[PDB]
Symmetry: D3
Subunit: 297 residues, 6 copies
C-alpha cells in the first residue's frame, strides 16, 4: 500500500482511508482524468517544491484538452499542494494532484459529468547508467491521444511499453512515433550528446517536460551548445551520450539501448554534470535558479 | 446520479454508497481498467441477458492485453451478473462489469498492482428518422498504439474526444477514421453499409469485434442477404443505399445522414430496419433459432 | 481542337462555340466539378451507350460528395446524353457529362454557388477497332488517401494527381502510370483500374482509395461468366512483377493487357491469353453481339 | 454575381460578360489551373498593391509545378495587374490572376494543351473600420479532412485542384458553426487553415508553423518580419492541436485574412478567450504597412498612380 | 563451420573450400542477391525435395524484382538442386540456392554487373512446448521500400535486426508489425491464428507468400477446417485460442506465448499440432493426395 | 573488372585475385555488411585522404547498429587505409573499407557469426534528377544513419529506375512524402540567397554535407536546416547534391522541370570550388580535414 497520509479532497484534508470515490466514476471506466507529478526537495531552508506554478499551469492545461472543468482556482490548488507537504510533515516527497470525472453518468461523453472531482496526495520520495529497449508500442499520434497533456488514458500506452521493457530485462522503454522516429520514454523526455553538442528532441508527440525545459536552461547556462532536433534510434546508438529527464527520473544517464552500448558504455561526463547541477538547483544551492523554488515554510 | 442499487464488489453485494475505491487506484490515474457492456431484455419467460458468455469471454480477453489478473473464475462473474439483475429486481437493464488496477502502487507499470479489483453494477435501461453522424477529427488509434480489440479504460479517451466533438457539432454520434483515412468505427459502435442489396460489414481493422456486429451478420445471412466484409472510405458510405451502426447500447441503429450528406433516401432504410426487427425479436426471446444467445435470469 | 459539335448546356443544345462559361467560375479556380466518361459503340442496331444508368448514378453520387446540387433529374440527363449522340449523328463516341460550380462567388466554400451548371458533350472516338501490351511505370505521386480527396468520386480537382502521374509516365517513356497509395500498395492507373492473373486465377484489386470502375465491374462479371475464379485483394508492386498477366480496365482503356511494368516484363512479355479473352468478350458485349449482356446497352435509335 | 468589371483576357481587357472560356477547357474538368490572391489598399498616395512581385513570382512557380507554360513575361502580368486596378477605378480590392489549361484536348495529360490561357480579374473589397468581430476572435474547428501529403498534391503551389481539399474542410467547419477550418496533415500535426497559415504565442514567444505541406504564405512572411522588427522572438516549429489549445494566443494570416486572432479551437477557448495583445498588435502594424503608413515597409508596396 | 561439402558453382560442383567469390562482389556491399530455402525429407523411397518447382519459380521471380539475370534455365537449376543432394549423400537436408551480383563494378546500380553468378549448397538438417515470440520494435518494410515478395538479400537486414532483438529479449522468434501497426510476419516465417475452431491465415500484405503457408491452407481445408484469410492486430493474436508459424525451416511451429501473454492454454494447441503432423506425413510421402508436391531424388 | 590491386584482408595485404570469401558468408545472403566510401586527392604535398577520422568513426558506428564486432582497433584500420593508397601507388582514388559477417552459420541472426571479417580496397578515381517510386526506408525499418549493405537494395532499385528513365540520379522521398536524399547523396536547395540543407531525417549524415555547411557559413551564406517537399525544390533558385563520390554536384533539372536558370547556379559553383580547393590542400583553414599519406 501507499503511505500518503492526509489527502486533500475537493477543498478539505481527510485521512487516506477516507479518500475514496465511486467505482462508477467516469474516469475509472474511460480514462478521463488528468494529473501532475511534482517534487519537493529538502533544502537548507526547509522543503522546497520545484517549479510549482509551471506544473499547476500544465494541470489546468491538461484539463482544457478534455474540456474538463476544475472547480478550484490555481491559487487554491497551489495552497493545497503546499499544505499536503506541511500537514504530512514531508521533506523530500512526490506530489500527485489528480482531477477526474465523477459518477454523475457513464455515457462516453464526459461533459455531463463536470465539474471534475479533485484531490492532492503526496508521499515520501545511474552511475552505470539506465538500460533502455525500444518498444513495440508506438507513441500515440497527435490526432489520436493528446500527448501534450497528462490524461489518464494516455498512460495505457506508457504502461504497455514500461511492462514490455521490464519484461525484456531493461530499466525503461524508449518509444518511437508511428513514423519510426524516437519520441520519448514511457515517462521521460530524451536527449543525446554528440561531439560536445547537446541535442534535445523536438516536442513532436511528447509531453513538454518541465525537467527537459530546466535541463536545457542549465545546459546553456553552463556554456553547452544546445540544438533541438528530430532523432532516429540509430542516431542515439551512435551518440557519445544519451540521457533522460523527468520529475521522477531527474537527469538519468543512459548507458545502453537495445543491448548496444552508448559511447563508453557507462554514464558520461555531460549527463553526470547536468544531473549534479540540477540537484544543486532543486536543493537551493544555485541563486540563479531560486525563482524555480517554492519553500513551504 | 446513477441508480445502480446493489453493486457486486469482489465477491459480495454492497449498497451503491459502499461501492467505492481509493483515489490512489492505478486505473484512476493511468486508464488501466477493462469493462464490458451487457444487456438484459424482458421476455415472456422473464429477463434474459444477451450473449452473456461472449461478453464475459471478452472481459477476460481484455484483461489479457493489459496482463491484468482477474481473481475470479468466469463462472463466478457470470453468476454475479445474473444476480445483479435479480437482487435489484431489474428486467430491462444495462450491466457494467469492471476490473481495475488498485492502489498498491502508482508506478506506471501495473503488474505490481495485480490482482485487479472487480465489480459488477447495473441500471434500468426517431429510429425511422435515422441517426446523423459527423466524421471526427480524432483518428481511431493504430493497432500498435492502443489495444483496440479490448475494452481498456484508457482507449475511451479517444472515444470521449470524438463523441464530445460530434455532439458539439450537432450530430448524434461520431464516425472515426483510422490514421490511414479509412472508416473505422463509431465512438461506441461498429459500422455497416448497404449497396445494391448487398450488406457490407467493415473489417475489424483497429476496431472492437462487436458482439452486436456478429449477431447482425448471422441474422443477415439467415435472412438470405449476401454479406461482404470490406475496408471502406467515407465517400463509399456517402454513396451507399443505407448505413447503420450496431452495438450493445445502439442495438441496430439506421444512419440517415453523415457529414450533412443524406444517405440514400435520407431516412432509415428497409434492410437496416429488418435487421433491427429480427434482432429485437431475438433478444426478447421471440426467435427459437436464436435462443442459444439468451441466458434467462429466472 | 475538340470536334464536339452540338453541346447540351443547362437544358438545351447550342453550337460548340457557344458552350462557354465565365472565367470567374468557382470550378475553374478550385477544381469544384464532377464529370463522367461514357462510351457509345456502333452495333448492328445502331449506336449503343454502355451502362448509361450506372454512369449517371455515379455522376450524381460524385456531386453528393461535394454537396453539389444538380438542378436536373437523372432521367433528364439520360435523355440529354442519348440526344447528344443522335443530334450529332455519332456512332462510336465518347460522352463527357460535366457539372461545375458557377460564378456566383469565389469564396473557397462552394455552397453559396449552388445549384451547379451542367453540360453534356460528346465526340467521335474509337472510329476503328494490343497484343504487344502496354508498358507501365510506377509513379512517384501517390494516389490520395481517402481523407484527403474523395477517390470514389470523379471530382475535377482529383485529376491533378492523375495528371501529374500521367505526365511523369509519358516523360519516362511509358504508356501509363501505375500509382501506389501512401502506404506503398498498388492503387490504380492515372485513369484505369488494375487486375493481375496468377496460376489461372484472376485477381481484381480492392477498391481501397480507387474509383469503383464500371469497366472493372463488367470485367469481373464476364470473367465469372466464363468460368474463371476471381479474387479481390490488396496488392504490392512485386506481386504484379511476378504475375502471369496484368491488365487495366476503364471506359477509355476498355481492357488493356499490360506486358511490362518498371521495365520488368510481365510473364511472357506480351499480352496474355486471359486478358485477351476478357477483352474480346467485353468488346463483343459493348458492340451488342452478346445477348446475355444486352441489359447493359441503351440503343439510341 | 461578382462585380468584376473589365477583365484582362490574354493580353487585352474585355467586359466581364465577354470573359468566358469553353466548357471543354481542361482545367474545368481536371483542376489544372493556377491562381493568385493579391490585395490593393488605399493609401495617401492612391491604391497600393501589396507585394506584387512576390505574388507574381509564386504564380509562375505554381505553373512550373504543373509544367504549365504561361505565354507572358512576368512584366506583362504585373502591368495587367496594375491596369486592372486603374481601369476599374478600384481603391481597396482583391485581385485574382488565373492561368488555366484550355480546350485543345481532354486527355488527362495537360502538356498537349499548352500554353495556358491567362486572365486577371479584380473586385472591390470592403475595408473594415470596426473592431468587435476582430477582438472577439475567430472560432476554428479541426477538420476531418487531412491536408494533402507532399507527394499527393503540390501544396507549395496554388493549383486549382488543391482547393477541393480546402473546400471540403471549409464547408465542414461552417456547417459545424465555426468561422474556419484547421487542417491537420496525415500524420496528425497541425498544417494550415483552408486558406490561411497558422501561428501561436506562448509566454511572449511567437511560434510560426513550419512549411510542411502548407503554402508558404506571403502574409506569414510579412508577419514574421514585422514581429522580429517589433522585438518579438520568433521560432518556427511543428505543432499539435493541443499545443494550440494551451497557447496564450493563436492567429491566422493570409492575403484575405490579413492577421486574424483565433479565440477558440474545437470549442476550447484560447488563453483569455478573446483576441490577445500580440495578435492585435501584429494586425495593427501589418495594416499600417499595407496602407502605406510604415516607411520601413514601403518597399512592399506598388502604387498604381 | 557449415558442413556443406560439394557446392554447385555456376555450372559445376566444387569442394566447399573452393566455393568463394571476390570480396568486391556487388552483393557483398549492397545486398543485391536472391536466395531460396528448400528442404528434402527422407521417405520410404529415398530423399524427396518438397515443392521444388514452386521454390525454383520463386527464385527466378525474386531475381526479376532486381532486374537480375540468371544465366541458367530453370531445368538446369532443378537438376543442380537434385545433384547437390545425391552427390553429398544427403537424406534430410536444407538446400540453399543463391544468385548474386558479382565484382564487375561497384556502382550502386547493379545492371552493369549482370549476369548474376549462381551457386547451390546444402547441408544436413519449441515444437513441444510451443515457441515464444515477442513483437519487434523493427517494422516490416513497406511494399515501396523493399520488395517483400522476393527473397532479396538486403531484405534480411530487417529480419536479422528483429531476430537478434527477440533472442536478446529471451524469446525464440520475433513477430514484426508493418508500419501501420498490423501484424506482418515472423523474421523468417508466416503467421496464422485459430479462434473458435476457425483457422485464420494472414493476408500477404508486405510479407513473403510462403509455400509452407500455401501447403498448410490446403491441408487444413482437406481436413475439414474452415480457413479465412485476414488482416490481424497483435491483440487479435493475444486473444486467439492458438497461434502458429509456418516456414520451410520452421515447418509448422505452434506458438504458446507472445509478449509474455499466454496464447489460449499457454501450450501448443491441437489444431497447430495436428497441422504439423499431417504436414510431416505429406512431406515424407505418407499421404498419396500430396504426392505431386514431392520430387524423389532417386 | 575492378583494378584494385593489393587488398588488405583481415590484417594483411594480398593480391586482388586472392581477396575472396566463402559463398556461404552471412552477408552475401542477408545483406549483413557495413562499408565506407573515402577519397584521396592529389596535393602539392602528395596524396591526401579527406576526413579519414570521420569516415572511420562512422564505419565503427555502422557496425554497432548491426551489433557487429570489428576485430581491429580504429587506429589499425586507419593505417590499413593509408597503406592501401601507398602500396598501390595511388594518388587520386576511392577507398572502400568493408566489414562483413562470415560463413560460420546461416541462421538469420548474425551474432553467432562474430567477429566480422574486414577488408580495405581502393582504385584510381548540372545533373538531372527524377523522383523515385521507391521511398527511402523509415527509421524503424532499416538503419539509415549507417552504411549497412542491405540498405543499398533500396538505393539500387531507385538508381536503376532513374537511369532507365533517362536521368543521372534518383531523388527519394520518405514514406510521408517529403524529400529524403539521393540514392547516394544528400540534398540542398537555395532560395533568395539562403542555403537550405535538408534535415537528417531518415538519411545518412553525410560528411560532404557537413563540410559544405561549414564552407557555406565561412563564405557568409546563411544556412538553414529544414524539411522539404518536392515542389519546394521545383521552385528553388538552385539545388545541389553532396557526397564523397559526387563531391558538390549542381542539379539543373528535377522531374523534367528546370531548376531556376536551368543550369548550374552561382552558389553551388562557389561551394564546389572551395570544396575542391579544400580537398586538394589549397585551403589552409581546412588542412585539419586532410591526412597526408606521404
Ligand atoms: C509521458 C511523459 N513524458 C515526459 C514526462 C517528463 O515530464 P516532466 O516530469 O515535466 O519533466 C512525464 C512525467 N513522468 C512522471 C512519471 C510518474 C511516476 O511516478 O513514475 C513524473 O516524473 O511525475 C511523462 O509522464
Ligand atoms: C469502441 C467500441 N466499438 C464497438 C462497440 C460495439 O460492440 P458490441 O457492444 O459488442 O456489439 C462498443 C461497445 N459500446 C458500448 C457503449 C455503451 C455506453 O453506454 O457507453 C456498449 O454498447 O456497451 C465499443 O465501445
Ligand atoms: C482515376 C480513375 N480510375 C479508374 C477509372 C476507370 O473507371 P471506369 O471508366 O468506370 O471503368 C477512371 C475513368 N477514366 C476516365 C477518364 C480517362 C480519359 O481521359 O478518357 C474514362 O475512361 O472516361 C478514372 O478516372
Ligand atoms: C491553402 C492556403 N494557405 C495559405 C494561404 C495564405 O497565403 P498568403 O495569401 O500568401 O499569405 C492561402 C491564400 N488564400 C487565398 C484564398 C482564400 C480566400 O479566398 O480568402 C487568399 O487569401 O487570397 C491559401 O490558399
Ligand atoms: C521473410 C520470410 N517470410 C516467410 C518465409 C516462409 O516461407 P516458406 O519457406 O516459403 O514457407 C521465409 C523463409 N524463411 C527461411 C529461413 C530459414 C533460415 O533462417 O535458415 C526458410 O524457412 O528457408 C522468409 O524468409
Ligand atoms: C545513402 C547515402 N546518402 C548520402 C551519402 C553521402 O555521404 P558522404 O559520402 O558522407 O558525404 C552516401 C555516401 N555515398 C557513397 C556510395 C556511392 C558510390 O557507390 O560510389 C560514397 O559517395 O562513397 C550514401 O550512400
Amino acid at each position: 500500500q501507499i503511505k500518503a497520509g492526509l489527502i486533500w479532497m475537493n477543498g478539505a484534508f481527510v485521512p487516506q482511508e477516507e479518500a475514496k470515490t465511486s467505482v462508477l466514476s467516469h474516469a475509472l471506466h474511460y480514462g478521463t482524468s488528468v494529473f501532475e507529478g511534482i517534487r519537493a526537495y529538502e533544502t537548507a531552508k526547509g522543503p522546497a517544491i520545484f517549479r510549482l506554478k509551471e506544473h499547476v499551469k500544465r494541470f489546468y492545461n491538461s484539463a482544457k484538452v478534455l474540456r474538463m472543468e476544475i472547480p478550484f482556482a490555481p491559487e487554491e490548488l497551489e495552497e493545497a499542494i503546499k499544505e499536503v507537504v506541511r500537514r504530512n510533515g514531508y521533506r523530500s516527497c512526490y506530489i500527485r494532484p489528480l482531477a477526474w470525472m465523477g459518477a454523475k453518468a457513464l455515457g462516453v461523453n464526459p461533459l455531463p459529468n463536470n465539474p471534475a472531482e479533485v484531490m492532492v496526495a503526496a508521499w515520501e520520495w545511474v552511475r552505470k547508467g539506465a538500460r533502455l529497449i525500444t518498444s513495440s508500442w508506438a507513441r500515440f499520434p497527435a490526432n489520436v491521444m493528446p500527448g501534450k497533456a497528462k490524461v489518464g488514458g494516455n498512460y495505457v500506452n506508457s504502461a504497455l511499453a514500461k511492462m514490455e521493457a521490464v519484461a525484456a530485462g531493461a530499466d525503461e522503454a524508449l518509444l518511437l512515433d508511428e513514423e519510426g522516429y524516437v519520441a520519448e520514454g514511457s515517462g521521460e523526455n530524451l536527449f543525446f550528446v554528440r561531439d560536445g553538442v547537446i541535442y534535445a528532441l523536438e516536442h513532436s508527440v511528447n509531453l513538454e517536460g518541465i525537467t527537459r525545459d530546466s535541463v536545457i536552461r542549465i545546459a546553456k547556462d553552463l556554456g553547452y551548445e544546445v540544438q533541438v532536433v528530430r532523432a532516429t534510434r540509430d542516431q542515439l546508438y551512435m551518440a557519445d551520450e544519451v540521457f533522460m529527464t523527468g520529475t521522477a527520473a531527474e537527469v538519468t544517464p543512459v548507458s545502453m539501448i537495445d543491448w548496444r552500448p552508448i559511447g563508453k558504455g557507462t554514464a558520461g561526463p555531460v549527463a553526470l554534470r547536468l544531473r549534479e547541477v540540477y540537484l544543486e538547483a532543486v536543493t537551493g544551492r544555485r541563486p540563479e535558479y531560486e525563482g524555480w523554488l517554492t519553500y513551504v515554510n
